[PDB]
Amino acid sequence: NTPKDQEIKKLVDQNFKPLLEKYDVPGMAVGVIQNNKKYEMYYGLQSVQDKKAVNSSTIFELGSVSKLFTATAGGYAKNKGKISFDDTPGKYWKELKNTPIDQVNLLQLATYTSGNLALQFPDEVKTDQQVLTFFKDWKPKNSIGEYRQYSNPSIGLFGKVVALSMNKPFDQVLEKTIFPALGLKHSYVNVPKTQMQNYAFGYNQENQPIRVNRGPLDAAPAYGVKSTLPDMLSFIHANLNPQKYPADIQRAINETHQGRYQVNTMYQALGWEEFSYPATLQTLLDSNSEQIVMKPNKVTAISKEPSVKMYHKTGSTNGFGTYVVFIPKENIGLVMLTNKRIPNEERIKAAYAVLNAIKK
Numbered sequence: 001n002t003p004k005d006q007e008i009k010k011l012v013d014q015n016f017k018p019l020l021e022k023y024d025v026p027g028m029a030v031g032v033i034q035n036n037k038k039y040e041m042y043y044g045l046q047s048v049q050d051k052k053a054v055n056s057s058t059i060f061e062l063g064s065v066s067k068l069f070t071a072t073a074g075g076y077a078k079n080k081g082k083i084s085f086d087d088t089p090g091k092y093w094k095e096l097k098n099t100p101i102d103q104v105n106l107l108q109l110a111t112y113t114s115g116n117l118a119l120q121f122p123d124e125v126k127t128d129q130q131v132l133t134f135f136k137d138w139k140p141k142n143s144i145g146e147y148r149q150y151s152n153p154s155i156g157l158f159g160k161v162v163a164l165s166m167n168k169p170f171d172q173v174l175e176k177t178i179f180p181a182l183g184l185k186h187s188y189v190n191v192p193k194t195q196m197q198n199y200a201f202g203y204n205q206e207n208q209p210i211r212v213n214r215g216p217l218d219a220a221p222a223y224g225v226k227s228t229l230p231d232m233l234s235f236i237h238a239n240l241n242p243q244k245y246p247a248d249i250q251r252a253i254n255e256t257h258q259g260r261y262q263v264n265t266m267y268q269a270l271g272w273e274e275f276s277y278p279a280t281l282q283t284l285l286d287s288n289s290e291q292i293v294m295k296p297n298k299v300t301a302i303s304k305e306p307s308v309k310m311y312h313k314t315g316s317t318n319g320f321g322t323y324v325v326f327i328p329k330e331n332i333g334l335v336m337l338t339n340k341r342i343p344n345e346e347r348i349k350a351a352y353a354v355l356n357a358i359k360k
Helices: 004-015 017-023 061-079 107-108 126-135 152-167 168-179 193-198 217-223 229-240 247-256 282-286 290-292 344-357
Strands: 029-036 037-047 261-263 266-268 273-276 309-317 321-326 331-337
Touching: 004 017, 004 029, 004 037, 017 037, 017 344, 029 229, 037 229, 061 107, 061 152, 061 168, 061 217, 061 309, 061 321, 107 152, 107 217, 126 152, 126 217, 152 168, 152 217, 168 217, 168 247, 168 321, 193 321, 229 247, 229 321, 229 331, 282 344, 309 344, 321 344, 331 344
Parallel strands: none
Antiparallel strands: 029 037, 029 331, 261 266, 266 273, 273 309, 309 321, 321 331
């Protein structure tokens, strides 16, 4: 017959490869892990002008998939006793004490329910002083905890507090504690000079190469991580097998898998979105609809706590797209990285087709 590695490659060719021509995407990396075996598929160019092929060393920007590492760092700090999720941010960032935002707890920040934090920091909020003023000028709108509004400043403040609790800057929390503990060796908040030859150009909608570092420093927990396909497969492996790690990072990973509330069929975990498995394709597409991503939604308590579940997260930057998904009880996951954005629905659809067709 046909070996599994070839079967997986054929499924990725059938479902992901056509996206390169359809969306004029220069380069793409797709990885699958099944039963602790990893399958890596590279396509196209990490740099068009340099004719440099995408490969296992290629570094991509993760966009909002960065939040999964921030969530892991918060789970680590919580299980080390450095924070409680019931704490408020002024316990750690003392300049926020006696301000309205100091009524919001860390779990509410991490899961986007403060009631008045928008998708992005304002364009003019650039320096650390402007970030502090932004949070001190914050006033509640909706009742705290009642509405989910997906928000980069909300989880950015969470990450800043996590880092304060660990007495290190956020970049050092990831690069010196969290990445080493997950065994990731080519993941960065700041790509060093000696790795720039491996950093893909991002490509904008005019297929022009772009190298953009966005927003204030305290937005890094929301969207500032870079990684390679092998590292992202290792990160999926850690999520599939937390029992294989030391107690503190194992508990950190498990913390990120705990659903906190629902919006319709979506369970909000820490960083991860979570779903009953098997999930219909429309459930997964709804999680990325304008209604869910861009508008405020009332949250409801979890009713069905799904025994059998799956998790995913999309991410994009101006020049990059990312999607990661895993299904614990099927021992499987998938990572897609591109150096041009393509619609989130296409990433979700292609991964759904691949994962449902792979022989069990």
